[PDB]
Amino acid sequence: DSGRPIGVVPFQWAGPGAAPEDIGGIVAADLRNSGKFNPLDRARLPQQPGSAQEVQPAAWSALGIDAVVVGQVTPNPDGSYNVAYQLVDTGGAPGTVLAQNSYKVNKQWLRYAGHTASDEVFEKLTGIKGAFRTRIAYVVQTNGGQFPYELRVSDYDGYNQFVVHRSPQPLMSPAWSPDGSKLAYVTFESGRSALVIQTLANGAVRQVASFPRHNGAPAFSPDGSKLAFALSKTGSLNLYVMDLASGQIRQVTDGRSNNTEPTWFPDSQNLAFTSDQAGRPQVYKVNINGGAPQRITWEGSQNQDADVSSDGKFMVMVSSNGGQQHIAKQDLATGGVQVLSSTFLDETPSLAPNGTMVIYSSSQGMGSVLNLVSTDGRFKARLPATDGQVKFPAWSPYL
Amino acid sequence: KGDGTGWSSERG
Ligand SMILES: [Ca+2]
Ligand code: NA
């Protein structure tokens, strides 16, 4: 129902006025974001302990809380900062340190230091790899006239955004390479649609495909050797795969129907995609070495835009169920579907590399904004807003 | 500017 109760104490700050960042706020919000933890409200804390020994287990047990996060933040002549946390047991081992660490970071990595604490605590208590130091990429339509579309990247939680690319035409569907160093996207900069790959550090741009008609929807294979995308030069959209070492392209689908929005399975062999071949969009699957695709979505009237988990256990998608469209999960072994979001005009979902969260676009006014839903359905939140309309969120791999 | 499906993430 609500996530496992946990106490996050405001981190101890030694110095000038107020701390430069609320490290324990970051740690609380992250843990809340995963759906897994219900951090006790800061106002409701029984004690603001500043280290592992200043923690009173009784106080915490009494509230159903078996772990407390405390930390410290100190400054360094060098303009840098020391950030430390201790995860203390208040359950079976009252007063025991379960995890702890120490960083030296510049002010600009304070959020990062909070996210490292989050990741470490998260993983110790759940045994699941933390995803709080991973980013998202998306397209923003701004109010600027000349370059209204802006391929951007930020931290999964909205902070620290930067611009990768500005365009006078539209940009669509960004995709991360599995090492997180490149993004693939559709650009219309030419007058026509084209698929490029951009190195983030560099800005270097590799041209991938520009055939007649349509070129879109990229997905990098998990092993890093391929790029799947859709092309409609035959007459309808069909799936193609490119060998990145050679530049060589295969046709994966043939079909008078439209086949688009490829997504990989963990084996870099199979893809799930969307096809209208059955009328209203449905999710299908196919091997890149051929064979016929198989439908895999029988729940609801329409299912499109899939994202398969990194372990291949499930998939998220845009689904029309009970007469409307939301983000929903399909257990790939059992077959069950769960509706996750409850906002309006839910599009483009993307999974976090540990499968605990989904980022998606939703409709608000004449504009788009970004939403985050835990994969268990418990936690829903809108991200900080920005200066224009936001579409096409892509969650990065671990970084 | 789109893929000309009317259904996809990439229509317009
Ligand atoms: Ca997609
Ligand atoms: Na952040």
Helix (H, G, I), strand (E, B) or coil at A61: helix
- Report how far residue A66's alpha carbon sits from residue A44's, in angstroms, rounded to the nearest whole number: 16
Q: What are phi and psi of A308, to 5 degrees?
A: -85, 140
Name the A residues in 288-327 with CB < 8 Å from any B CB. Answer: 304-305
- Number of C-alpha atoms within 13 angstroms, CB side, residue A78? 6
Residues A310 and A328 sit within 8 Å (Cβ to Cβ): no
Q: Which two tokens stand for residue A172?
A: 């669509």
Q: How far is A214 from chain B (nearest CA, A)?
A: 6
Give the separation between CA A312 and CA A306, rounded to whole angstroms.
Answer: 12
Q: Do A172 and B10 touch (CB under 8 A)?
A: yes
Contact between chains at B4 and A214 (C-beta distance less than 8 A): yes
The position carrying tokens 């799947």 is A228
Sort out which chain B residues have CB atoms less than 8 A from A305's CB and list them: 8-9
Pure H helices in chain A: 23-33, 57-61, 110-126
Q: How many residues can be counted in chain A? A: 399
Measured distance CA(A308)–CA(A289) in Å, rounded: 19
d(CA A336, CA A280): 20
Is residue A174 within 8 Å of residue A137, measured between CB atoms?
A: yes
Question: Looking at residue A44, what DSSP letter applies?
Answer: G
**Which of A255, A221, A223 has the alpha carbon at shortest distance from A239?**
A255
B-chain residues near A316 (CB < 8 A): none
Return the amino acid letter for B4.
G
Q: Which two tokens stand for residue A373?
A: 């839903």
Q: Are A242 and A229 in contact (CB under 8 A)?
A: yes
> How far is CA A57 from its chain centroid?
35
Chain A residues whose CB is inside 8 A of the B3 CB are 193, 214, 216, 230, 232, 237, 258, 260
For residue A195, give every residue at least 6 positions away whose Cβ sits within 8 Å of its Cβ, in sequence order, or none: A184, A185, A186, A187, A208, A209, A210, A215, A216, A218, A229
By DSSP bridging, strand A367-374 and strand A294-295 are: unpaired
How many angstroms is it from A158 CA to the middle of ligand 2?
A: 6
| Residue the block writes with tokens 């995860």 | A87
Please name the residues in contact with A348: beta carbons below 8 A apart, sequence gap of 6 or more: A305, A318, A360, A361, A391, A392, A393, B9
Q: Rounded to the nearest whole angstrom, what is the distance from the C-alpha of residue A112 to the centroid of ligand 2?
A: 7
The C-alpha atoms of residue A170 and residue A242 are separated, in whole angstroms, by: 23
Cα A66 from Cα A62, distance rounded (Å)? 9
Q: Which ligand is nearest to the CA of A25?
A: 2
Gap between the Cα atoms of A19 and A104, Å rounded: 15
Name beta bridge partners: A138: A152
Which structure tokens are listed for A344?
A: 């309006």
Alpha-carbon distance of A16 to A389, in angstroms, equals: 38
Could you tell me the distance, in angstroms and rounded to a whole number, from the CA of residue A239 to the centre of ligand 1? Answer: 13
Query: In terms of Cα–Cα distance, which of A28, A16, A24, A32 is closest to A380?
Result: A32
Q: How many CB atoms within 10 Å of residue A313?
A: 13
Neighbours of A215 (CB within 10 A): 25
In order of A25, A44, A87, A90, A289, the CA distances from A19 in angstroms are 12, 21, 21, 27, 57
Pick left, alpha or beta for residue A74 (phi over 0 → left; psi -120 to 50 → alpha; otherwise beta): beta
| Pairing mode, strands A37-39 and A12-13 | unpaired
Residue of A nearest to B12 (CA): A170
CB atoms within 10 A of CB A390: 22
Establish if A170 touches chain B: CB-CB under 8 angstroms. yes
Q: How far is B11 from chain A (nearest CA, A)?
A: 10
List of residues 6+ apart from A57 with CB closer than 8 A: A89, A90, A94, A95
A273 Cα–ligand 1 center, Å = 9
Say which DSSP state A277 is in. Answer: T
Amino acid occupying residue A344: F
Cβ-count burial of A152 within 10 angstroms (0-12 exposed, 13-18 middle, 19+ buried)? Answer: buried
- Residue A318 corresponds to which amino acid? V
Cα distance between residue A67 and residue A82, in whole Å: 23
Query: Architecture of A134-399 per CATH?
Result: 6 Propeller (2.120)
How many Å apart are CA A105 and CA A76, to the nearest integer? 10
Distance CA A10, CA A399 (A): 27
The CATH number given to A1-133 is 3.40.50.10070
Domain boundaries, chain A: 1-133, 134-399
For residue A150, the cross-strand partners are: A140, A166
* 3 state SS of A32: helix
In chain B, the largest separation of any two C-alpha atoms, in whole Å, equals 14
**Smallest Cα distance from A185 to chain B, Å:** 12
Residue A364 β-bridge partners:
A367
Mention every residue, 6+ apart, whose C-beta is less than 8 A from residue A364: A344
The answer to whether the CB of A88 falls within 8 A of the CB of A124 is no
Sign of CA dihedral A277, A278, A281, A287: negative
Whether chain B has a CB inside 8 Å of the CB on A214: the answer is yes
**Greatest CA separation for chain A:** 70
Burial of A256 (0-12, 13-18, 19+ CB in 10 A): exposed
Q: Are A36 and A4 in contact (CB under 8 A)?
A: yes
3-state SS of A94-140 is CCCEEEEEEEEEEHHHHHHHHHHHHHHHHHHHHCCCCCCCCEEEEEE
Measured CA to CA, the distance from residue A228 to residue A265 in angstroms comes to: 12
Query: Count of CB atoms within 10 A of residue A202's CB?
Result: 9
- Single out the residue of A336, A339, A299, A303 nearest to residue A319, CA to CA: A303
Q: How many whole angstroms separate alpha carbon A268 and alpha carbon A376?
A: 26
Cα A367 from Cα A384, distance rounded (Å): 14
Radius of gyration of chain B (CA): 5
DSSP output for A362-392: EEETTEEEEEEEETTS--EEEPPP-SSEEEE
Measured in angstroms, how far is the CA atom of residue A249 from the centroid of ligand 1? Answer: 20
Neighbours of A266 (CB within 10 A): 15
Q: Classify residue A300 as exposed, middle or buried by CB count within 10 Å of its CB (0-12, 13-18, 19+).
A: buried
Amino acid (one-letter) located at A343: T
* Residue A234: φ, ψ to 5°: -90, -20
Instruction: Retrieve residue A399's tokens.
Output: 């970084």
* Shortest Cα–Cα distance, B3 to chain A (Å): 6
The closest CB to that of A305, out of B1, B4, B9, belongs to: B9
Nearest to A188 among B1, B7, B9 (CB): B1
- In this structure, the number of other CB atoms found within 10 A of the CB of residue A192 comes to 15
Closest residue in A to B10 (Cα) is A172
